[PDB]
Design an enzyme around this catalytic site. Structure first.
Site, short mmCIF file in Angstrom:
data_model
loop_
_atom_site.label_atom_id
_atom_site.label_comp_id
_atom_site.label_asym_id
_atom_site.label_seq_id
_atom_site.Cartn_x
_atom_site.Cartn_y
_atom_site.Cartn_z
N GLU A 240 15.15 12.13 -66.16
CA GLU A 240 13.99 12.48 -66.93
C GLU A 240 14.19 11.78 -68.33
OE1 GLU A 240 12.55 16.84 -68.57
OE2 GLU A 240 12.25 16.24 -66.48
N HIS B 205 16.45 19.87 -56.42
CA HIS B 205 17.46 19.50 -57.40
C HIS B 205 18.36 20.63 -57.97
CE1 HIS B 205 18.83 17.17 -61.00
NE2 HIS B 205 18.32 18.09 -61.81
N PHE C 76 13.02 15.17 -74.35
CA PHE C 76 13.16 15.63 -72.97
C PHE C 76 11.98 16.58 -72.69
CE2 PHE C 76 16.36 16.22 -69.35
CZ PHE C 76 16.92 14.94 -69.34
N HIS D 58 12.80 18.27 -58.90
CA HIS D 58 12.85 17.33 -60.03
C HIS D 58 11.77 16.30 -59.72
CE1 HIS D 58 14.20 14.18 -62.80
NE2 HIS D 58 15.09 15.02 -63.31
C1 LIG Z 1 22.40 17.42 -58.93
C2 LIG Z 1 22.19 16.98 -60.39
C3 LIG Z 1 22.10 18.02 -61.33
C4 LIG Z 1 21.94 17.77 -62.70
C5 LIG Z 1 21.84 16.40 -63.17
C6 LIG Z 1 21.91 15.33 -62.23
C7 LIG Z 1 22.09 15.61 -60.84
C8 LIG Z 1 22.15 14.39 -59.89
N1 LIG Z 1 21.73 16.15 -64.53
C9 LIG Z 1 21.70 17.18 -65.49
C10 LIG Z 1 21.65 16.94 -66.93
O1 LIG Z 1 21.66 15.80 -67.40
N2 LIG Z 1 21.61 18.00 -67.79
C11 LIG Z 1 21.64 19.36 -67.34
O2 LIG Z 1 21.52 20.29 -68.15
N3 LIG Z 1 21.74 19.59 -66.00
C12 LIG Z 1 21.77 18.55 -65.07
N4 LIG Z 1 21.89 18.78 -63.66
C13 LIG Z 1 22.05 20.19 -63.21
C14 LIG Z 1 23.56 20.52 -63.53
O3 LIG Z 1 24.38 19.28 -63.38
C15 LIG Z 1 24.21 21.46 -62.57
O4 LIG Z 1 23.37 22.63 -62.64
C16 LIG Z 1 25.65 21.78 -63.14
O5 LIG Z 1 26.48 20.62 -63.22
C17 LIG Z 1 26.37 22.90 -62.43
O6 LIG Z 1 27.76 22.86 -62.46
P1 LIG Z 1 28.59 24.10 -62.00
O7 LIG Z 1 29.80 24.17 -62.84
O8 LIG Z 1 27.71 25.33 -61.90
O9 LIG Z 1 29.10 23.52 -60.57
P2 LIG Z 1 29.22 22.26 -59.80
O10 LIG Z 1 29.49 21.28 -60.75
O11 LIG Z 1 28.30 22.06 -58.78
O12 LIG Z 1 30.60 22.55 -59.31
C18 LIG Z 1 30.89 23.55 -58.27
C19 LIG Z 1 32.44 23.78 -58.22
O13 LIG Z 1 32.71 24.88 -57.30
C20 LIG Z 1 33.65 24.50 -56.30
N5 LIG Z 1 33.35 25.23 -55.02
C21 LIG Z 1 32.19 25.33 -54.35
N6 LIG Z 1 32.37 26.05 -53.23
C22 LIG Z 1 33.69 26.38 -53.22
C23 LIG Z 1 34.54 27.10 -52.31
N7 LIG Z 1 34.03 27.58 -51.17
N8 LIG Z 1 35.89 27.29 -52.59
C24 LIG Z 1 36.45 26.77 -53.73
N9 LIG Z 1 35.65 26.06 -54.59
C25 LIG Z 1 34.32 25.87 -54.34
C26 LIG Z 1 33.56 23.03 -56.16
O14 LIG Z 1 34.79 22.40 -55.73
C27 LIG Z 1 33.22 22.62 -57.65
O15 LIG Z 1 34.41 22.33 -58.40
O1 LIG Z 2 16.75 14.22 -65.39
C1 LIG Z 2 17.98 14.43 -65.71
O2 LIG Z 2 18.87 13.82 -66.33
C2 LIG Z 2 18.38 15.99 -65.29
O3 LIG Z 2 18.26 16.03 -63.87
C3 LIG Z 2 18.66 16.87 -66.24
C4 LIG Z 2 18.49 18.29 -65.84
O4 LIG Z 2 18.75 19.04 -66.80
O5 LIG Z 2 18.60 18.63 -64.62
#
Ligand SMILES: *Cc1cc2c(cc1C)nc1c(=O)[nH]c(=O)nc-1n2C[C@H](O)[C@H](O)[C@H](O)COP(=O)(O)OP(=O)(O)OC[C@H]1O[C@@H](n2cnc3c(N)ncnc32)[C@H](O)[C@@H]1O
Ligand SMILES: O=C([O-])[C@H](O)C=C([O-])O
Ligand code: HEM
Ligand SMILES: CCCCCCO[C@@H]1O[C@H](CO)[C@@H](O)[C@H](O)[C@H]1O
Ligand code: SF4
Ligand code: F3S
Ligand code: FES
Ligand SMILES: [K+]
Ligand SMILES: [K+]
EC number: 1.3.5.1
Lengths: 139, 239, 101, 612
Positions: free
Chosen positions: D257, D355, D121, D244
């Protein structure tokens, strides 16, 4: 937390006393050949059972025995084309249920589950049903 | 120039309960809209009627939020292409035979409770060593989970199943049964016999009659019907 | 504790039997096949309509009423078929006679 | 009195049910705390479910590894804006964290020995940057987030945590600078709920939807970040936005990636593998900020592909089709659906796409939210944050791929461990005034009945187009200034909002308007922070201030150098505040933490020139 069983009970208690409508289903769902053949399997099975039950009941309640009624029909000299058509209609549901029943037993052995196989086995069953019925009605 | 497409959509407002469910027609210019049905729904809500209500989150077919019935079949609005034939009106309804909370939003709480009831988590006879070292699993045993772990719990398959329509209070449905199978065949899980014993009643598993609407409608291309058949074979042969 | 899977297995076994009785009815018409069909047709049909009731009838009372009536129907059906096989020409011969029209 | 309020008492409340929130919530329940998890979505719909490439941990399953090499890659990746005590905690705890997930049943892909498969990665190396490409990104093909979230959700079902699903958190209940719970709207029936608790964990995700094109879900609206801003607490480093390198052209959907980790390459309209020129050694596996800038220059210089010459190509067709099917089945499907491309025959059209947010609510390495007063960090009693909503800051000015999923489970667990060592279950619940939260309800009612001239969707599109054109990959002072003024005018114009749905059950017109207020608070802090930061570091690139400005010029020997005073350099975290009535942004700064948790076992890494 709430156990899965308590969540299910709350779901029914809440929705049955609410004003929410039930979204449409059988009236808006798109039909497919496998779906139509599935309810037809049930329909033919039920018709066949009712048939056997009526026969059994006629045996116990009719005044005369079987040969007498066969002779009476023969005495009418009905059109052989009409007789042929009647034999086709009688054997069609049995032929359909038997061939599709075999298709069901093959699924129970775990085979023929790809969508293309489901569609192909279904058309094969319709062809066999038509060929069988045509051949049997002519004898 | 423009290319006007019509959509007829199911409407019901719980805050005006007495007004019966109805269909409302909207006109959308496809030259100014993305290619998927969800794009049209968002364009309608943003430009024509902000009271139009539906669930959505990821827009790429992975979260499972936007499941609904489009042109008669259950699918994800975000990966379903709009039909560009301007002479046909596309009909949109909520997932079938479900209690409607509002417009295109169904109550999925029974579906989620059924899922919890099959204990969808790893169980070992002795869990006291958890967290110390990776459990080993061969490439061949891991390959057995392909086609099973990808389920996004969208409920498109269970709500397309007539057995689930008539007996969803006691039949677990294709989605939940396929996840029961995913835990039964995982080589690291030690409770296969108990998982099967849970289905020894007339409804949980046995209301399935191999109609196969489930596999036809799955937006992820999985085969819950085949998984149910594999469970029925295990139920018949286990000791 | 395995009543459900046992039932499912018995249902498939009986379906298979009926399948074999068809050819046997054509190759070995007679009392053995006649009474075998009477029993298999009655049992397969009983369990089949039983699945239909389970799927479409709801409510503790309606389900018990339905299943009680089903038992009565199956009883009368097996009796009539056995009766027909004992005092009349029998299933195989009746089918051959009907087809001679 | 128009809105009946329902009160709940708990030992702890977690807002968010993505990977960080679930790990924190059942972590608290497994320690004996009576815990509530409040989430606006059913848990498995969270953005975490869309993650693809994997999660990093020095398990050493592919070659010998060392968690201190992962520590070094992460500090260099952060361009020295990352806090080394938190990075030390996360990388050292990574192997145990990934083993915990596998033992929960997560279906990781496997090696010939039956252990967890790990891929290459971007920006990861062996031997403190001297030894070649590392292979430490553990994965489940290219659906790693989907499996992680579904595994954590299933595990959560084994505990007594109370879940409040489709509840939208509106604000923190603060009293004497201490958090004592949260107030929320139950979307299903329109009621207002107050969750009182001794400790509250914010795990609400990022705010990528402030832009016009992003890989983020429609639900990533910065809601927890805005609650902290409304409580008068500072947010941190909001100007560092990760683009990204590869979102799909048009739709914006992410293409992992992991494609480049498995051998894929980026090419321009002339067929040239251009990263060989921008990053001679790392090539297509350089850090994200470098690859996104390189792609942007290729397009600016006329070598973009397609009829509009506005994107580049990701080529995978030279790879064996069995490898694409086993390692990249998810993107294979997505490329077909959204770009009509068969990856075994043609390249995927891609371009840099917003992203992930490096910035968020500031915390210490134990997960406690902090503020900064008179040059000292101070813990906010009873308040924690983890996941993308937080700034620990393990990522600094640029996050390494596969380090966020790691951050979620490591810091979600740390918030629970810290509360368990600080409090005991059943202690008394703090009191709140009888009318606590009334301002949140009053704001909700105002929006529900809004009858102005600018509808919510118009104001939202205005904000998104301004961010996209004024705070993109390359920035400059005059363009950032015009964006600041345009956003400030859109904020004042929220007074003219117009909504139409007057109901209260499932009123998404109203929920989306509340989300727009949250997004605008995040957007203002991002662009004002960017305009003030006159240097280039990680993801923030100024064409008018091209150099990174540290306390020393680290490209020369330190002997005899005159150290720049705090106020004269930029190696420091931006802290932002907003006066909610006017929209006026105030900025302050706090030092980066360079010390580790144990110098002897893991030494601090001094700033150095950063190249790939
Ligand atoms: C967008 C993205 C990011 C990503 C990725 C692929 C995509 C398309 N692949 C990744 C990967 O392979 N490896 C990695 O290390 N990171 C990767 N990313 C980034 C990562 O997925 C995100 O940074 C991560 O999943 C963050 O998760 P987190 O637990 O911080 O939160 P979330 O999953 O977005 O969930 C948010 C939760 O909060 C609740 N929420 C939001 N607002 C409210 C309000 N107002 N009230 C009550 N609840 C709220 C949502 O319902 C949710 O459950
Ligand atoms: O390219 C991915 O799978 C990715 O988007 C992972 C990070 O960590 O954000
Ligand atoms: C004469 C026959 C009669 C009276 C009859 C009657 C029935 C009935 C009433 C059903 C229930 C329908 C349903 O549940 O949808 C049924 C089902 C079925 N029958 Fe028959 N049947 C006959 C012959 C056969 C034969 C020759 C085979 C082979 C066969 C195979 C099946 C199978 C496999 C089913 C179960 C379908 C499922 O899996 O849901 N039947 N039959
Ligand atoms: C009265 C006879 C009913 C036949 C309905 C056929 O229906 C058609 O079946 C094919 C194949 O399954 C599908 O691909 C079509 O979408 C469906 O409309
Ligand atoms: S099996 Fe397919 S249709 Fe059913 S819930 Fe899973 S993804 Fe949805
Ligand atoms: S549609 Fe239903 S009947 Fe069985 S094969 Fe699928 S669960
Ligand atoms: S919005 Fe996520 S599946 Fe459609
Ligand atoms: K097993
Ligand atoms: K962050």
């Amino acid at each position: 937390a709430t156990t899965a069983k308590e969540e299910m009970a709350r779901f029914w208690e809440k929705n049955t006393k609410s004003s929410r409508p039930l979204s449409p289903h059988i009236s808006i769902y798109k039909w497919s050949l496998p779906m139509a053949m599935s309810i037809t399997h049930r329909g033919t099975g039920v018709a066949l059972s009712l048939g056997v039950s009526l026969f059994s009941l006629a045996a116990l309640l009719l005044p005369e025995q079987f040969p007498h009624y066969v002779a009476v029909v023969k005495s009418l000299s009905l059109s052989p084309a009409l007789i042929y058509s009647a034999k086709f209609a009688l054997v069609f549901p049995l032929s359909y249920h038997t061939w599709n029943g075999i298709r069901h037993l093959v699924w129970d052995m775990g085979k023929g589950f790809k969508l293309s196989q489901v569609e192909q086995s279904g058309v094969v069953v319709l062809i066999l049903t038509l060929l069988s019925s045509a051949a049997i009605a002519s004898e | 120039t423009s290319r006007i497409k019509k959509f007829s959509i199911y409407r019901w407002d719980p805050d005006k309960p007495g007004d019966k469910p109805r269909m409302q027609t909207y006109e959308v210019d496809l030259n100014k809209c993305g290619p998927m049905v969800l794009d049209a729904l968002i364009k309608i809500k943003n430009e024509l009627d902000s009271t139009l209500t539906f669930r959505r989150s990821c827009r790429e077919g992975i979260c499972g939020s936007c499941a609904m019935n489009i042109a008669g079949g259950n699918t994800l609005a975000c990966t379903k292409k709009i039909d560009p034939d301007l002479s046909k009106t596309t009909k949109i309804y909520p997932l079938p035979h479900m209690y409607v909370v509002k417009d295109l939003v169904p109550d999925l709480s029974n579906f989620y409770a059924q899922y919890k009831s099959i204990e969808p988590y790893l169980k070992k006879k002795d869990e006291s060593k958890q967290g110390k070292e990776q459990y080993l699993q061969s490439i061949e045993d891991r390959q057995k989970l392909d086609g099973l772990y990808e389920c996004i719990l969208c409920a498109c398959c269970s709500t397309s199943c007539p057995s689930y329509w008539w007996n969803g209070d006691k039949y677990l449905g294709p989605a939940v049964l396929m996840q029961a199978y995913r835990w039964m065949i995982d080589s690291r899980d030690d409770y296969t016999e108990e998982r099967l014993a849970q289905l020894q009643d007339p409804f949980s598993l046995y209301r399935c009659h191999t109609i196969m609407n489930c596999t036809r409608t799955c937006p992820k291309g999985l085969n819950p019907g085949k998984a149910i058949a594999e469970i029925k074979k295990m139920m018949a042969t286990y000791k | 504790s395995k009543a459900a899977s046992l039932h499912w297995t018995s249902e498939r076994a009986v379906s298979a039997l009926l399948l074999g009785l068809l050819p046997a009815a054509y190759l070995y018409p007679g009392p053995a096949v006649d009474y075998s069909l009477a029993a298999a047709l009655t049992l397969h049909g009983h369990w089949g309509l039983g699945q239909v009731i389970t799927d479409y009838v709801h409510g503790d009372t309606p389900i018990k009423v339905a299943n009680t009536g089903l038992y009565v129907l199956s009883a009368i059906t097996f009796t009539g078929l056995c009766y027909f096989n004992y005092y009349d020409v029998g299933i195989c011969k009746a089918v051959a006679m009907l087809w001679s029209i | 009195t128009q809105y009946p309020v329902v009160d709940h008492e708990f030992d702890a409340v977690v807002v968010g049910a993505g990977g960080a929130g679930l790990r924190a919530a059942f972590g608290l329940s497994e320690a004996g705390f009576n815990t509530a998890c409040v989430t606006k979505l059913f848990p498995t719909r969270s953005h975490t479910v869309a993650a693809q490439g994997g999660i990093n941990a020095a398990l050493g399953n592919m070659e010998d590894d060392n968690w201190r090499w992962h520590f070094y890659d992460t500090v260099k990746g952060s361009d020295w804006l990352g806090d080394q005590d938190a990075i030390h905690y996360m990388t050292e705890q990574a192997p145990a964290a990934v083993i915990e997930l596998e033992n929960y049943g997560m279906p990781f892909s496997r090696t010939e020995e039956g252990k967890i498969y790990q891929r290459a990665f971007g920006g990861q190396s062996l031997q403190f940057g001297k030894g070649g490409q590392a292979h430490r990104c553990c994965c489940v093909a290219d659906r790693t987030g989907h499996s992680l979230l579904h595994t954590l959700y299933g595990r959560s079902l084994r505990y007594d945590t109370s879940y409040f699903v489709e509840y939208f958190a509106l604000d923190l209940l603060m009293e004497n600078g201490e958090c004592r719970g949260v107030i929320a709207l139950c979307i299903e029936d329109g009621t207002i709920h107050r969750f009182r608790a001794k400790n509250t964990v914010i795990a609400t995700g990022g705010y990528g939807r402030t832009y016009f094109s992003c890989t983020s879900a429609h639900t990533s609206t910065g809601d927890g970040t805005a609650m902290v801003t409304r409580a008068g607490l500072p947010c941190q480093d909001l100007e560092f936005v990760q683009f990204h390198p590869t979102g799909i052209y048009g739709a914006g959907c992410l293409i992992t990636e992991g494609c480049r980790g498995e051998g894929g390459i980026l090419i321009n309209s002339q067929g040239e593998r251009f990263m060989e020129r921008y990053a001679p050694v790392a090539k297509d596996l350089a850090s994200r900020d470098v690859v996104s800038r390189s792609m942007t220059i290729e397009i600016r210089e006329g070598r973009g592909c397609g009829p509009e010459k506005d994107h580049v190509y990701l080529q995978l067709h030279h790879l064996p089709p069995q490898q694409l099917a086993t390692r990249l089945p998810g993107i294979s499907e997505t490329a077909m659906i959204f770009a009509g491309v068969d990856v075994t025959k043609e390249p995927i059209p891609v371009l840099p796409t917003v992203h992930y947010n490096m910035g968020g609510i500031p915390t210490n390495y134990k997960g406690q939210v902090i503020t900064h007063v008179n040059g000292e960090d101070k813990v906010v009693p009873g308040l924690y944050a983890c996941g993308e909503a937080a700034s620990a800051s393990v990522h600094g000015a640029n996050r390494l791929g596969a380090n966020s999923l790691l951050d979620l489970v490591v810091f979600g667990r740390a918030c629970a461990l810290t509360i368990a060592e600080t409090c005991k279950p059943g202690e008394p619940v703090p009191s709140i005034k009888p009318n606590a939260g009334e301002e949140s309800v009053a704001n909700l009612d105002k929006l529900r009945f809004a009858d102005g001239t600018i509808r919510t969707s118009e104001a939202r599109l205005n904000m998104q187009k301004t961010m996209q054109s004024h705070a993109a990959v390359f920035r400059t002072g005059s363009i950032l200034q015009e964006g600041c003024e345009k956003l400030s005018q859109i904020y004042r114009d929220l007074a003219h909002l117009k909504t139409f749905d007057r109901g209260i059950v499932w009123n998404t017109d109203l929920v989306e308007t509340l989300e727009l207020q949250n997004l605008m608070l995040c957007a203002l802090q991002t662009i004002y922070g960017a305009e003030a930061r006159k240097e280039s570091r990680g993801a923030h690139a100024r064409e008018d201030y091209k150099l990174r400005i540290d306390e020393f010029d680290y490209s020369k020997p330190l002997q005899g150098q005159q150290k720049r005073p705090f106020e004269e350099h930029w190696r420091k975290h931006t802290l932002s505040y907003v006066d909610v009535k006017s929209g006026k942004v105030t900025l302050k700064y706090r030092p980066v933490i360079d010390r580790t948790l144990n110098e002897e076992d893991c030494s601090s890494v001094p700033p150095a020139i950063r190249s790939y």
